[PDB]
Each structure stands twice: as structure tokens, then as C-alpha cells.
Specification:
Elements lengths: L29 H4 L1
PDB class: de novo protein
Keywords: cyclotide, plant peptide, cyclic cystine knot, DE novo protein
Assembly: monomeric
Length: 34
């Protein structure tokens, strides 16, 4: 639950996630999908 262009992205690091998306431990950009 957050504004992201890519709502489903895997992450290398947090800064690789676009918008409000943060990198989670599972390796996904969680915040956008959440």
C-alpha cells in the first residue's frame, strides 16, 4: 500500500525500489505492493 509505478518489483536494495516502495527481507519491493 504505497504509490509506486512498479507495484511488483524485486529489489537489490531499497534505493532500487521506485516511489514509496521499500525493499523487504523477502527481496520484494513491499510498500508499493502493500
Amino acid at each position: 500500500g504505497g504509490v509506486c509505478p512498479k507495484i511488483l518489483q524485486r529489489c537489490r536494495r531499497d534505493s532500487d525500489c521506485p516511489g514509496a516502495c521499500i525493499c523487504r527481507g523477502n527481496g520484494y519491493c513491499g510498500s508499493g505492493s502493500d
